[PDB]
Amino acid sequence: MKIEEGKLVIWINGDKGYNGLAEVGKKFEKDTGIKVTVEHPDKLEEKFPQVAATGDGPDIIFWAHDRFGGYAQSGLLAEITPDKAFQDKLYPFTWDAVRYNGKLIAYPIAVEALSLIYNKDLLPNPPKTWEEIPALDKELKAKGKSALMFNLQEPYFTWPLIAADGGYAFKYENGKYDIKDVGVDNAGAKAGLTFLVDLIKNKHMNADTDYSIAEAAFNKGETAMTINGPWAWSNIDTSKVNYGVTVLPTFKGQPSKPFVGVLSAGINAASPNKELAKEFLENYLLTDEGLEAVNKDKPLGAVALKSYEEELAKDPRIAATMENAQKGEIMPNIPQMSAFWYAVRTAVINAASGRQTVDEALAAAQTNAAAEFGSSYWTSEYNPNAPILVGSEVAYKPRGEWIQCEVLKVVADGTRFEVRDPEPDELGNSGKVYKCNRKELLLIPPGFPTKNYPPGTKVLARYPETTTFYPAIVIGTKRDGTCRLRFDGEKETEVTRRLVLPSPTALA
Amino acid sequence: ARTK
Ligand SMILES: OC[C@H]1O[C@H](O[C@H]2[C@H](O)[C@@H](O)[C@@H](O)O[C@@H]2CO)[C@H](O)[C@@H](O)[C@@H]1O
């Protein structure tokens, strides 16, 4: 039998109520005699396809519904089999979010939307408009506070502002999303992102702010407002902050338009435990008692289960969540969503940091949101392996040196690439073109690096005055991020962090 | 490629 057989393994994001979910697990364990293990690995939405594609991975995966069409298309999700009596228990809107090609491919759990969260003591009357935020920040800075902090590293949190004046992901025409009609580079999207960039230029926000920083600042009473979802309320309750949850500010007189996500639970197509998974989800989790256990840990939002929602509906924070949801739009679940999110993430980060202008960043996003991408076989905790796009720079291993190449084509669902060494070759002055697989290339990340390699790490690094990557060892990393290296088989050599990659020889 |  498969190693996975005879138990349940469940993945859920670290910002959700995994401890509450484990309480539901324990009830199931008591009745069935079968073990349930809840895990919350980092980047689980990226890890899941890699492990599920080999027939491994968790039996049940939790994520917002947007990523599930891609998983389903890829053959990674089982069609679920709820009967009509069970289907009646959940709102039809929520079932719709988990349909792909007319089939139910997950169980819906709860409706999520971002709201404006504000400190009632610092700010009893929060601003109705984005335009009011600069003056409010000027006022608050005089007492060593700031107006607003929210996660600028995930485009989810900036999307409501991008969409407000007309930005959109994919246009919905004739019952379907048109992957050739992307709206991230129209006047509305430009206006919203420009407003964000201006907030940063004018020192009302910091481009480096992430989820943890914004949460800590709000919960410690340092900033008067944040933008977050229901899952965040528990930590605020525990803090000493008196908070309200309200409608997002308008931009150019129009509502902010947050994406609406339905937290959903899919069953791995390869799981030998599909019946156990169905029993857990239908008979334990999607009950008043099951959802209450998770919700008590971290709030779910507006739950899919009608009977339990009749209670939560009266919570003013839930009223605010649904007001914001109504003003927004349900995320698509099409397979192109992963490419869309990589593209918008990169545009927001690059524009916020000033590395690119708004126009430059959104033009690139428009192109790439609609593109096929691949990933290197080689994974590292220190360097990303995706997305490999047309126009990406990679190190390629000719059939221990690797050579710098540009990606010309990505084909066969990212399993085959056409890459070009742009240096003149005897067979063409424009450079030699190679065809390769995922094991033969490494992504050179195009953006500012995020993590140091620990001293002693074997790496591949571009040698000064060359376009060739050679094996080396990391001696250390400077404050500015520069790598100090000893190249194999040659003073130590300083190489920019961007040009230092994982070593497949070491990884293998 | 350019080499060392
Ligand atoms: O930022 C892109 C990201 O947005 C959404 O993820 C949300 C998620 O829905 C929320 O429940 C919470 O975990 O915050 C996440 C943002 O960090 C999409 O669902 C996700 O696919 C996408 O990558």
| A423/B1 CB distance under 8 A | yes
Way the structure was solved: X-ray
C-alpha dist (Å) from residue A332 to A99, A132, A172, A335:
11, 32, 9, 9
d(CA A162, CA A432): 41
For A97-214, where are the E strands, in sequence order?
A: 99-100, 103-104, 107-112, 115-119, 146-148, 168-173, 176-183
Structure tokens at A369: 């949101």
Task: Please report, as a single letter, which amino acid is at residue A461.
Answer: A
First vs last Cα of chain B: how many Å apart? 10
Are A487 and A472 in contact, with CB atoms under 8 Å apart? yes
To one decimal, the resolution in angstroms is 1.5
The protein residue with its alpha carbon nearest to ligand 1, atom 3, reads A156
- The verdict on the CB of residue A113 being under 6 Å from ligand 1 is no
| B1/A465 CB distance under 8 A | no
Q: Which residues contact A49 (CB under 8 A, 6 or more apart)?
A: A70, A71, A74, A76
Are A379 and A385 in contact, with CB atoms under 8 Å apart? yes
Structure tokens at A306: 């009608």
Can you list the domains of chain A with their CATH numbers? 1-113+257-333 (3.40.190.10), 114-153+206-256 (no CATH), 154-205+334-371 (no CATH), 372-445 (no CATH), 446-508 (2.30.30.140)
- The verdict on the CB of residue A67 being under 6 Å from ligand 1 is yes
The protein residue with its alpha carbon nearest to ligand 1, atom 23, reads A341
Are A266 and A77 in contact, with CB atoms under 8 Å apart? yes
Count of pairs with CB atoms under 8 A, one residue in A, one in B:
21
A261 CA from centroid of ligand 1 (Å):
8
Count of CB atoms situated within 10 Å of the CB of A112: 25
Most informative mutation of A154, A159, A264, A333 for ligand 1 (most atoms within 8 A of CB): A154
Q: Which residues contact A340 (CB under 8 A, 6 or more apart)?
A: A169, A170, A182, A184, A369
Instruction: Classify burial at A159, counting beta carbons within 10 Å of its beta carbon; exposed 0-12, middle 13-18, buried 19 or more.
Output: buried
